[PDB]
Amino acid sequence: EITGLFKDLTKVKHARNGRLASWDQRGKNQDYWEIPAGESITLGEIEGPGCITHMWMTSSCRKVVAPSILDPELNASAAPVMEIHPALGVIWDAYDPFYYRKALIKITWDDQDTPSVLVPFGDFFCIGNSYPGNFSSLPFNVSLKPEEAGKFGAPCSVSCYFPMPFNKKAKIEIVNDNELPFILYFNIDYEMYGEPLPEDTAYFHAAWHRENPCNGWGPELQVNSPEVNNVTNFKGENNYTVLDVEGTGHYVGCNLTVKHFQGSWWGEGNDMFFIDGEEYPSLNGTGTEDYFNHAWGMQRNAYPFFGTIVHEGDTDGFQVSYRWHITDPVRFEKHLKVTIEHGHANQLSDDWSSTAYWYQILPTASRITIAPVEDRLPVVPQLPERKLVLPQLTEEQQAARDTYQKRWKDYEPRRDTQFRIKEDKARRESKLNTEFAKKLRDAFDAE
Amino acid sequence: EITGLFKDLTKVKHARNGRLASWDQRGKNQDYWEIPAGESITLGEIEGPGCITHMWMTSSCRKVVAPSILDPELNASAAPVMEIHPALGVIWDAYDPFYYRKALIKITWDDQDTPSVLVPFGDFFCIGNSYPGNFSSLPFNVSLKPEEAGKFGAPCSVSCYFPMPFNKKAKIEIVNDNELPFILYFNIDYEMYGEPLPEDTAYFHAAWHRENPCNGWGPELQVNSPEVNNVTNFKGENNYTVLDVEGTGHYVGCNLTVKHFQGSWWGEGNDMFFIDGEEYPSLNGTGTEDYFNHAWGMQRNAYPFFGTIVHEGDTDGFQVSYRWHITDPVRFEKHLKVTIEHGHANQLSDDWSSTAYWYQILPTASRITIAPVEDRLPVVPQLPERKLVLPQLTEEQQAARDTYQKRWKDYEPRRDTQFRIKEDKARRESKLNTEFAKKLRDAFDAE
Amino acid sequence: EITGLFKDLTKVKHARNGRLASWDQRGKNQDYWEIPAGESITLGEIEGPGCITHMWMTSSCRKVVAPSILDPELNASAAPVMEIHPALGVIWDAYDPFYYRKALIKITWDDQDTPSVLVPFGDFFCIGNSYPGNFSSLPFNVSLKPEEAGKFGAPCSVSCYFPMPFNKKAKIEIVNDNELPFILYFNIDYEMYGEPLPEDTAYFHAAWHRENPCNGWGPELQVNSPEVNNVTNFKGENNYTVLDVEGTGHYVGCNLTVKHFQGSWWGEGNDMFFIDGEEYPSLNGTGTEDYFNHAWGMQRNAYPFFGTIVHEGDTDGFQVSYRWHITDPVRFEKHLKVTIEHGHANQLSDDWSSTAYWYQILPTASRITIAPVEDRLPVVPQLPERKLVLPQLTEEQQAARDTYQKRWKDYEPRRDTQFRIKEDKARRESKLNTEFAKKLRDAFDAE
Amino acid sequence: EITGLFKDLTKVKHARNGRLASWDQRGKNQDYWEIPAGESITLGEIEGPGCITHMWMTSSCRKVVAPSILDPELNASAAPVMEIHPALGVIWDAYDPFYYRKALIKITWDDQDTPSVLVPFGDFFCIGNSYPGNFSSLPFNVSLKPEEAGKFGAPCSVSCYFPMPFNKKAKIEIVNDNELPFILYFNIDYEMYGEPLPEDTAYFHAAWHRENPCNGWGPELQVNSPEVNNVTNFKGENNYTVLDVEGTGHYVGCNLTVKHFQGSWWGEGNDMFFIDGEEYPSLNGTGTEDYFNHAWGMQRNAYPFFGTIVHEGDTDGFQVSYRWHITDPVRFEKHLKVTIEHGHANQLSDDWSSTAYWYQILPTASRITIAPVEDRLPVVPQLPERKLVLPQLTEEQQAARDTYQKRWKDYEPRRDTQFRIKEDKARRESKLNTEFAKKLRDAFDAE
């Protein structure tokens, strides 16, 4: 009979599709949710048994910083994002650079008392450092326009093909720790099953970590100096920790964001895997790019199972990398610790953050935590404070300043009102999304 | 034991390879078929049980438009396509622009009364608008030389890796509705099985559709104006129809060719899927690029499961896109309607054409039809006619024109004869292909 | 329940991960082996039952050609490869151009009296002609820096995802026929199983071949001339042979390196497959790029199942191509001969070399042999020997020459000593890798 | 003493700078003129003796096609050009494609009864076919953003460094034959002399011509066919005419716009120059790209004295080329005819237009004339008429259409009012420019 990776297309399954989407439930063209500031919102709850098969999202986070001559009430029903150059003098909706780190995606399975996915919104979808890079891999993709590329908080399309099965419940939320609301478009595709999945089905988990700085013993020594290279590290007690989880499952890989400070090479450190509580690692690697299957540094390649999302050569000292263990998972019966030396023998004190992805049987024994929002922001240089003192103003210059400020006082509250109306639609459609998914489950189960 | 997408490589299967190919059955180097004008030709018939595993093709359609100083009889045995610049003045075989829409690929399973695949030759192989774009995806690939790219009817290699099981019969035909013959190279690889395929085996299906113009209510209104955006559309009675099919199976995606007329954006319309006769769509999308897993327009990306084949930014207003639902298929027990609003709430009157791909158990309940050839040609701007008046001619210029017309009246019928000869080879090898596949079937079944 | 190519991620397997790596077992930052000149070295032996799931390697081979002002003893403990421009006048470690062809990879399964893999180190990893090209495919990848690309012996990352099951034993070796040692970094991942694999399990095999020159009847005749194209070849006695193997299994593809001499096109020859001892080929192709799923020449494309690794357009007359038959394998019960005509009807006398990959049930019936190292080297044009005569020397010029000669006489032997020390580390780590793999085997089976 | 092309920087000149500019004479930031539709406007008149040394311009011509949610009265005081994507739904100011051909630049010297420069605005500044290309040469330059390039009527900066001496008067005018007004920014630099120039001083002249179609004897014969190539032409009576002028002076070159119809090569025709009424040309060229100092076609090169502005390989069949005879001028005592064969022996019937540049002693003997606006428009292919029909409209769709039509009824006249006010400023500043230029002249002469 039929073999190979396409074989399942040649047999029918009695499974019912459903979809959680930001679709405009007024039937109009606002097919996005305005996610409120400082709030969690449920994209949907799905009753199992079923499986998530595909996620697509895109997003925008703009801060109103100047009055516009665009009617704000009518503007609210036009295109949702005013991609208009500030030089035209007619509007200024600035880019919020770090909104991908200020928002989390949170997934809970089977009404467990802990989430199984708790990751910044960006990093989950392989946006490191809140700074998108255009790439394709087999389970994750980012479609980023070249004219939006190379800035913090650039808009782009994200897609996830990692399957997420659940016997009883799926609850998918966005946690917005931002002071600003943001626009989220999403299509979360699943299928519902007519019979339970095997009780030992492995469920999709993801967790985020940052060490900033890494606790390096030699940050001021040149990388690859004879003195650094002859230091020993076997047990890897101080290694950067990608994942430290208790249970039965397999790790399926990571993304890694590195901001490197000395301007040599951040990546001499070995991956070291500790399976099921062993004291010394059974799986020893050779270097950090080596783990990501590049060599002599990272290259501007993004391959199905590994590579570069954002290359250091294109940025102010930061790299985003990924490797998927899809046909080569790292398996564990009791425990897995995934580590990488942060520089050779933990020499360096760079800014490392990572998303770890794994599958495991429930219950989820490890309690997944997230650093608070103030520990999630990119490290960026800052212009020194310039204490501008106004020259002597003509009456004409003072009246321009006063007229503009009066426009700003009238305009900003009118935009605020339009934001509040859209946030109301989001909270309303959150409920509707869960209600329709319940109706779909019940109608499917009834036959 | 062995898991992951490569696992079937680790176990033998008692199945016998065969291949339908345009190989030169004289044993010489004309390993192509001259497909005759206005005729159908059978690439081959294969007795089941078996599965199509791979198709590769390439093609050329030239029109002789000028006399050549190349001996036409010897020229017939040189390379099959005279890629010689018209400025050399020695030959002119002009490119036929729309031959990809004028020819169909037609596949009938198990001696059914209706084809299960009836699609223009281009569109089946993800050439939209008879206008190749270079790209790769998991099931379909086009390899297009940059020097041939950017023109109607460019030569290129096409490859398909969608499996096509059949229990009783496969009949693969080209329907050439062109006034010209065209050169076809092909390799269709299949394997033969020793036992029947299960009765719930889903068979490969594809069908082509166009709405030109779409029935837009606001083609002259600016896209994303507040008036357009506050129109409602829940039921999608007037949505563009990608697929409307009765049976049990699953949709596995589409290509979509859009020629956009107003010069704004064509893509605001939501995908809406109607499963198993439901009145309101159960699967609600957010936008057309969103369905194709891009955002804020389409990008010049072609990923394994989605993207752009031909970008609007490179063309005279047209886009060719695809999405594959290989791990996330849209299943149906009785019926499936795959629709997309043509602009938000079907505002727009653009030229939309699509290839829908799906698998279903037999029988093919739905008679698959195709629009006639006059309805399949790309919409292109035309130069105004120029009623050129010859100047007063010198004797020398009159002699040149007469000598050239004489050369043309001798040369064209010599080229016509060489075409007719190659067409007799194609008709001969059609029969031989089916005879050999029968020998191979009988020898395999004897052992 | 769960379907599609990711499905195996949703079930746990009670299998234990292991890895053979070049990790520094002093715990320091020499995570590479200095592979000795004219020696074989075991990367590791693993006791089955198990499966290789992933290999990553990179390599460097430099010849010391000038004295350095870098302290040679300290330099041994710095970065392993001195990528320092010779115009600085401080060091010169020249690139060894053909080391990819002078070293072999050699894999023996279940203690058989033949290796099952015996292929030049480069060709195995889809580096043809000892001349890397940057590309991705589903099973094999090369990540080559653009700065390093376009030369013989360029450093690059290689990865292999073809699974390699074994019930009793895996033995992975490098055979270095080079007069120079070379640096090898490697990570070889596998999993160990608690029960045997089915005895009918198909084992990974690969073998290498070269015809230089091919035995052409008409190398001086223009390709695609009428005289060439009307020559017949049905039976393919003189076809280039990619593979000729007795057993039960399936061919999963090749790489092919062609150096072309006449400056026209090397690729008119058809693939012809002979299954189970048939006299005439049952699988006839149409041309060599056609086999590689390109058309009208090879393109600068590398797609998941086929394409170009190195494009003839970018070199001095040579191409490196691949095709993978992963979902479309060529199966055989008794025998398989994979051939391609070398030019149409074997017209041409070019330099062809290939790696064939297949799976088969044990035993390996025939010894896999390899051409000796003198027959494995790329064909490169040579500068005529420029018999330089020194002019009359000033005393200062003579003293400069003597001083330099003297530095070289002291420096070279100090670099030799440092190579011998690293070679001793490789031989020591060879034994430790096998001992650790046995400990892991025993501790796994103990549970 | 000092030599070379820089030498004149080492000697002072008792000459006064002046400048005609579109500077905002309200002292605000509208430093452009809205040139009224269907009017001429004087950029300025300058009393001699003096010399124009430098001209810079840019321009914009938008058509309001949709209602804006931008307040139009406030919008008039923001940036002058709403470079805002129509897909945002907030504004639509469409590009007018042919304004470069609908407006002329007209310069009259010494109050003569003819202009000495009468050339379409675009063509004068080496914008051919109302289609800018980015380039630099010694006397003319275009700086065109890549984002704006590849479209009719793209905004770009133009600069002219040809000197224009005048003993008595310079009058510089724009002649706007467009139905639409357009924005013009300009800076025209000159110096004023304290004594007359020698009376024999040669004055700058330019004239424009178009032959569409050219009067070809053989447009349907393949270019470079032996029949075409053996037709003779010594006297060039039917040659394309770049310049045909009576006086004493020198030709300093041309730009040439060709739209080529047969898709071979337009450029086999020789330049032939007839000096001082000779019957047979004394200067015989070899081909059209040869005249332009390219070969085997035109290249994407733009060099100080010659090259390509717009390359045929980037357009729908049209090329724009230039040559400057700055050190190699073509001198005449009584008469010059500059001709080029329109294809070999005037075979072809393509669309040729040119700007000829020359210097000559006054008087300008013959009126410089120009084809009327309807004879100046690029030849472009036209889409067939779409004859859309509205479907049956919902009450909602009808209400949206009525609301949008009402917004447009109100909005368009509001934009018309703002254009009329800016046109009043242009007419006002025309007078002020000439008044100020007279005050400068008188103040300088007083000194």
Ligand SMILES: OC[C@H]1O[C@@H](O)[C@@H](O)[C@@H]1O
């Ligand atoms: O890729 C080989 C080695 O080169 C260096 O960049 C190290 O990080 C690595 O282990």
Ligand SMILES: OC[C@H]1O[C@@H](O)[C@@H](O)[C@@H]1O
């Ligand atoms: O990608 C987000 C949204 O942007 C617009 O171009 C819409 O087509 C889409 O719904």
Ligand SMILES: OC[C@H]1O[C@@H](O)[C@@H](O)[C@@H]1O
């Ligand atoms: O790809 C079509 C044909 O063109 C030539 O390059 C041949 O090698 C091939 O069979």
Ligand SMILES: OC[C@H]1O[C@@H](O)[C@@H](O)[C@@H]1O
């Ligand atoms: O450049 C040499 C010759 O090549 C052809 O394109 C002719 O137009 C020209 O005279």
Ligand SMILES: [Ca+2]
């Ligand atoms: Ca290391």
Ligand SMILES: [Ca+2]
């Ligand atoms: Ca929408």
Ligand SMILES: [Ca+2]
């Ligand atoms: Ca052939």
Ligand SMILES: [Ca+2]
């Ligand atoms: Ca000529």
